[PDB]
Design a protein around this ligand. Sequence first.
Ligand SMILES: O=P(O)(O)C[C@@H](O)Cn1cncn1
Ligand SMILES: O=P(O)(O)C[C@@H](O)Cn1cncn1
Ligand SMILES: O=P(O)(O)C[C@@H](O)Cn1cncn1
Ligand SMILES: O=P(O)(O)C[C@@H](O)Cn1cncn1
Ligand SMILES: O=P(O)(O)C[C@@H](O)Cn1cncn1
Ligand SMILES: O=P(O)(O)C[C@@H](O)Cn1cncn1
Ligand SMILES: [Mn+2]
Ligand SMILES: [Mn+2]
Ligand SMILES: [Mn+2]
Ligand SMILES: [Mn+2]
Ligand SMILES: [Mn+2]
Ligand SMILES: [Mn+2]
Ligand SMILES: [Mn+2]
Ligand SMILES: [Mn+2]
Ligand SMILES: [Mn+2]
Ligand SMILES: [Mn+2]
Ligand SMILES: [Mn+2]
Ligand SMILES: [Mn+2]
Lengths: 176, 176, 176, 176, 176, 176
Amino acid sequence: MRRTTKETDIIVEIGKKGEIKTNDLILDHMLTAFAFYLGKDMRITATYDLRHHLWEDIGITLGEALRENLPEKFTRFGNAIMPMDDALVLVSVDISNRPYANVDVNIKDAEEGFAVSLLKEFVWGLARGLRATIHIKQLSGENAHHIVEAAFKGLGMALRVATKESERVESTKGVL
Amino acid sequence: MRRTTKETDIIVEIGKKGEIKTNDLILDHMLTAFAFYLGKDMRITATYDLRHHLWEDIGITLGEALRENLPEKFTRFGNAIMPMDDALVLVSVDISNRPYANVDVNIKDAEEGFAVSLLKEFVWGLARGLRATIHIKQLSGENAHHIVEAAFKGLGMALRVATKESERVESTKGVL
Amino acid sequence: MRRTTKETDIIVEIGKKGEIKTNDLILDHMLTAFAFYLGKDMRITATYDLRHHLWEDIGITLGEALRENLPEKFTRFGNAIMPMDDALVLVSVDISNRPYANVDVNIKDAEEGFAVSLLKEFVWGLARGLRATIHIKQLSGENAHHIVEAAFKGLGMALRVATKESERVESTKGVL
Amino acid sequence: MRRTTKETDIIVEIGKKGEIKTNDLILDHMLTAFAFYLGKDMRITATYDLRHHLWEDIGITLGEALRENLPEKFTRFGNAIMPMDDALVLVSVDISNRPYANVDVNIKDAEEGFAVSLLKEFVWGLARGLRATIHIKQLSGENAHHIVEAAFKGLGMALRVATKESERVESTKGVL
Amino acid sequence: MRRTTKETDIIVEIGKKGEIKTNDLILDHMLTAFAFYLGKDMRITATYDLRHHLWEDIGITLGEALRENLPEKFTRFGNAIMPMDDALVLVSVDISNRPYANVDVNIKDAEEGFAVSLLKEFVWGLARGLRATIHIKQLSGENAHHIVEAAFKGLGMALRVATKESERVESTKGVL
Amino acid sequence: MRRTTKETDIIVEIGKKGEIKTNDLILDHMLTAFAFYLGKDMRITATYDLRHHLWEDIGITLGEALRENLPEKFTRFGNAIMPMDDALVLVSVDISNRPYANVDVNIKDAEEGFAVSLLKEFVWGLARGLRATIHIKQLSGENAHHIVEAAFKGLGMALRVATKESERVESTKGVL
Ligand SMILES: O=P(O)(O)C[C@@H](O)Cn1cncn1
Ligand SMILES: O=P(O)(O)C[C@@H](O)Cn1cncn1
Ligand SMILES: O=P(O)(O)C[C@@H](O)Cn1cncn1
Ligand SMILES: O=P(O)(O)C[C@@H](O)Cn1cncn1
Ligand SMILES: O=P(O)(O)C[C@@H](O)Cn1cncn1
Ligand SMILES: O=P(O)(O)C[C@@H](O)Cn1cncn1
Ligand SMILES: [Mn+2]
Ligand SMILES: [Mn+2]
Ligand SMILES: [Mn+2]
Ligand SMILES: [Mn+2]
Ligand SMILES: [Mn+2]
Ligand SMILES: [Mn+2]
Ligand SMILES: [Mn+2]
Ligand SMILES: [Mn+2]
Ligand SMILES: [Mn+2]
Ligand SMILES: [Mn+2]
Ligand SMILES: [Mn+2]
Ligand SMILES: [Mn+2]
């Protein structure tokens, strides 16, 4: 999946062994966590002007890539509760075709490179590209890196469950 | 399972392909959700005088029907965390033989047909008929329909887990 | 544009002389306002189970209908400030391909048939179907009908501006 | 229009196709937005010592360039209300010959490169170079980039209106 | 349009080149502003006993004169956002045939001759004579003269829009 | 696993049919719960001077016993949400090699033999002996016995998941 604008140029290829190299070492780490806990190899390359555009557009392109990869009938729902030392983060996903994100974190000890702005824009991008409902709810924690990385691990774990093949269309209304 | 009083007359048949028709369109939708996420066909028909009596007595009868269908040795415990757009609802069930319900929701945007009274009385009815401990804990949300429907989806998912056969009596005291 | 689920069956036909008949007299009035201030005839018909499903699905279908009718190059942005007696409501739209809604109203004098739940679900449906950013911000007011009707008038007026043909792709990133 | 001090050297040429290259990627993006929504090509080049000096002196030089470009009789007033996802920003301009700026924003989620100091100094610079009254009033929002970029888009849109030719001197006192 | 009582005698002639002379220098200035931003010449002369009676009765007579001059089918709605140095004032008009005024200002630095009483009574008079809904909402400001003059400029600008000819009766109910 | 100091002498033998006899009937019950929900037989015997030393040292010894039994590649993460009547307790474990415990309970109705001191010291002992991150987070509840027993049931259930064999080293850093 490739997405190109005048701001960013992003390639996300799920199922291909390859590097994750976005030219942002924080995002590279977060995406490495995401892919590891999703349980899939992926190749991700990006160029960008501003980090916000990178994080958001990575989210969009990753979402679109996940959507393209979905089986016809998929499990739809997946959750994860992820600890990382002091951090404890609930991640809940519904591949609902109703884009929505709610990211509720409370970072006490900030860390350079980790920003709520960037986390939120990645998650909104992902929600919009995948066309999904995504909740990130911090239950405990203080450290920025532990909170944000737990969220990315959790997204991977939750989507591992939600993107699995199902025997039915998982909606009482008969369509998503 | 049939339960008849001077107020209501209710039939719940689990495992039978059939209609869910209670003469309350909101409850029909909630029960459709419940059954879908439980993963069982059911036929439910009711007549009633007042909606409270309907919701409670449906809970009792459904609980009794679930209890009748349990294997001798069952998993006992099941949880679900269910998102619906803004709503995020935790449902926790223990088929404990200790009737108890705790329903903790916070509806900001009310909706006609959706009432905490009716939800609580359905859940207490279910707890009493099944003979179970049931928690409904809203983690996030504003919209009445999203919150209540998430609760019914969650009850279905949780009971899907809790009602499966187990290799042992699931209690250290040796009996339920 | 026809959209059909097990819950609702909706037709929205923009540019066609016809009636607006949803089987909800409040919504019929709101949509009549919307269409009048948009400056287009439309035919709308619906069947539904529950009013929430109606309001949301009308939003979705109307949004998709507006998206289908959008010129290749469109103005993208449109605003309205709409008074109705005590009410004064700001509506701001960006046809951004970034679904988002923020509805901030404060109804002091409630009115049967008018609910924040239903307004919010219509607007989120519209945002998701059109793929747009939509703000509704009450500046003044107390009366439910005045506030909500002002919002619908304002959506029509704002979308009248935003859906007009433009000479260019209205984004510095080169893509919408 | 060129302005040179011991701190900065800035060229702003309105109506010339060219690059916007200030050696600050955030400002380049903001100025690209400004020019796009103004509806004019411009060439902007700068060297600078400190970013504050750049932002302020860009504002001054851009203001002077806009002032030089004004027709004899101009519309004087222009407004914009600009959404960007969560952000909603009102921009109001009066080319009054009374330099004044009031920038009222509330950034909840900060972003590296985006600072209220720099926004305010650009706007004051612009107000002083153009000789104008400028209000930036955040109505909604949390994200720094969305708020600041909406302000720059809004300045462009507002000045598009205010700098258009008029049939009269737009003041009851007979002069500006 | 002439209106005579035992308290005041007022002539308002729209479209006539002429003096604005009410024997109140503050009101003469405000009305000069109003007429300038409306974009019409007018002749206004008054005698009065008390300033309140003047301001109110000028509003009534001006409203009646505007009403008399309306085309059969008129635009109905008009808004303005007007800055004046520190002041930023929103004016919203609906020629609704439902008299109503809401004037919400917050003057920090008072000025002799400028009073909320007089502004409010002019606006209510105008609403009653024209038969219109009028909102004046201060968004920012401290100085009495800047706030009140912005309101009069804004009323002129808003009514410039609202009083233009339209192709239709601008109401879904088919009549005003 | 035998651990002997001048204060305590503890045997924990996982996978062995035997009794749990610590000379503290509360701890015997808690450990019976832990083992049952872990899904393992175990033999535990202890002598001790002071109950704190017992609870802590049981934690340490049990943790070391679990660590000894861990497969080379293990699942690492496990969670449980456990109801017991009024109580609802979240337990989250990461076998991280980063000892940490956070126990957040709120006992309203105290019970002899049940103490936050002792619970916390058992959990910290377990965290240190296993070399793990352990969160215990009360979501609801009042009764001391229900809260504490839910925590022990939850630890068993969570560790059942976390101690299972995996196909890989469960860390992006390549080392645990
Ligand atoms: O789409 P699904 O499968 O979640 C079922 C819908 O009834 C949910 N819903 C969303 N808004 C009101 N109800
Ligand atoms: O009945 P179970 O299997 O949950 C085991 C009991 O010890 C629980 N309990 C209830 N009250 C005090 N303890
Ligand atoms: O897409 P457009 O036209 O609004 C231009 C983007 O730079 C906006 N943006 C959104 N998030 C950060 N920047
Ligand atoms: O200069 P203009 O056209 O806005 C008209 C002036 O009367 C405004 N003003 C500024 N301070 C007091 N009055
Ligand atoms: O008169 P219009 O054109 O604004 C349309 C009316 O429905 C408005 N309204 C006033 N009160 C309740 N509704
Ligand atoms: O050790 P793991 O597998 O959890 C991966 C690490 O990056 C986590 N981490 C801990 N502190 C900062 N990052
Ligand atoms: Mn963004
Ligand atoms: Mn890390
Ligand atoms: Mn009852
Ligand atoms: Mn529903
Ligand atoms: Mn909905
Ligand atoms: Mn109406
Ligand atoms: Mn400065
Ligand atoms: Mn941007
Ligand atoms: Mn009076
Ligand atoms: Mn003046
Ligand atoms: Mn100790
Ligand atoms: Mn017990």
